[PDB]
Ligand binder design. Structure first.
Ligand SMILES: [Ca+2]
Ligand SMILES: [Ca+2]
Ligand SMILES: [Ca+2]
Lengths: 175, 52
């Protein structure tokens, strides 16, 4: 009657790379069935994950984006496949996968190109979350500025939007 | 000529959220609550605290 699905396409996809020892992959899965027997994580739920571990301010905004991004398909529902995939990259990766994953987040439209409008959206989110943003005092200011400076710093081509290619460079330039 | 030093470091942090300054400690006790929340937060956060 009730099985567990993805109990073959996953383990098989591995047999090579695996940022989650066997006994692990099937582990989070079971945790998924709980949160949702139909293997479907909706925004409402995701929103509760953060709203629970950070009731301080209103990390909500960050939950709406982080969730919309965590979903590579961006269909409104996050399936286990997408969840676990991130649970790993989010941690180890042995590759600049971190800069790439970030790009997707900084691009709501995920149109391969980010937009000053999108960058701000996120920045504004991380602003209304913790209090550290306060200590920032020294220089910097509302998000509107942070972004205006970034683009002018990570985009000397002034094209309104940037691509993963330039995004990576502008980043590796921080150090 | 830009001062994009602290901005790049600190920012990326919050994005990945701080390393601590949250709740207190976890332990086998939760039940009625979803397990997907504790797994992600506790993991994604403590595991992301690493930096090559
Ligand atoms: Ca999806
Ligand atoms: Ca864009
Ligand atoms: Ca550009």
């Amino acid at each position: 009657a009730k099985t567990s699905k993805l109990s073959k396409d996953d383990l098989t996809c591995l047999k090579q790379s695996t940022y989650f020892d066997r006994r692990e992959i099937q582990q989070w899965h079971k945790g998924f069935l709980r949160d949702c027997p139909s293997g479907q994580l909706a925004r409402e739920d995701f929103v509760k994950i953060y709203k629970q571990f950070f009731p301080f301010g209103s990390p909500e905004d960050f939950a709406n984006h982080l969730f919309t991004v965590f979903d590579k398909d961006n269909n409104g529902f996050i399936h286990f496949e997408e969840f676990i995939t991130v649970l790993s990259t989010t941690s180890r990766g042995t590759l600049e996968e971190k800069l790439s994953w970030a790009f997707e987040l900084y691009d709501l439209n995920h149109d391969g190109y980010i937009t000053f409008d999108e960058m701000l959206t996120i920045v504004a989110s991380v602003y209304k979350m913790m209090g550290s943003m306060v200590t920032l005092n020294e220089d910097e200011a509302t998000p509107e500025m942070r972004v205006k400076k970034i683009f002018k710093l990570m985009d000397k081509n002034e094209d309104g939007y940037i691509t993963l290619d330039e995004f990576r460079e502008g980043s590796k330039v921080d150090p | 000529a830009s001062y994009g030093f602290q901005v790049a470091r600190r920012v990326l942090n919050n994005l990945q959220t701080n390393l601590f300054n949250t709740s207190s400690g976890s332990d086998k006790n939760v039940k009625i609550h979803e397990n997907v929340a504790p797994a992600l937060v506790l993991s994604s956060m403590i595991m992301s605290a690493i930096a090559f």
